Amino acid sequence: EQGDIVVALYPYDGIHPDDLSFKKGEKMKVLEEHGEWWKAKSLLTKKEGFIPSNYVAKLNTLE
């Protein structure tokens, strides 16, 4: 859901300006879920952009 903290499982290089580029282990805040791609904010760079949702996992997976 919106505001959840996620961690990158694999790195990803954005191909377009609206994408975030991240490394494995990078922490991001999910802003909006839009199917396969989510809008997120890198907690390291504070930059926002779309990320492939299959490349991240919730830091909280139990609840």
Side-chain angles (χ1 to χ4, degrees), residues 26-40:
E26 190 162 346
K27 306 311 187 292
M28 289 168 280
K29 177 181 186 178
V30 176
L31 300 175
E32 309 164 342
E33 299 192 1
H34 295 295
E36 283 169 44
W37 294 74
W38 296 350
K39 190 183 182 174

Side-chain angles (χ1 to χ4, degrees), residues 16-49:
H16 296 291
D18 67 354
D19 300 325
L20 271 192
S21 290
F22 50 84
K23 300 293 182 300
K24 174 180 172 168
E26 190 162 346
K27 306 311 187 292
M28 289 168 280
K29 177 181 186 178
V30 176
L31 300 175
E32 309 164 342
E33 299 192 1
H34 295 295
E36 283 169 44
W37 294 74
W38 296 350
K39 190 183 182 174
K41 182 176 166 187
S42 167
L43 297 182
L44 169 61
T45 74
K46 310 308 179 181
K47 181 176 160 181
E48 299 195 353

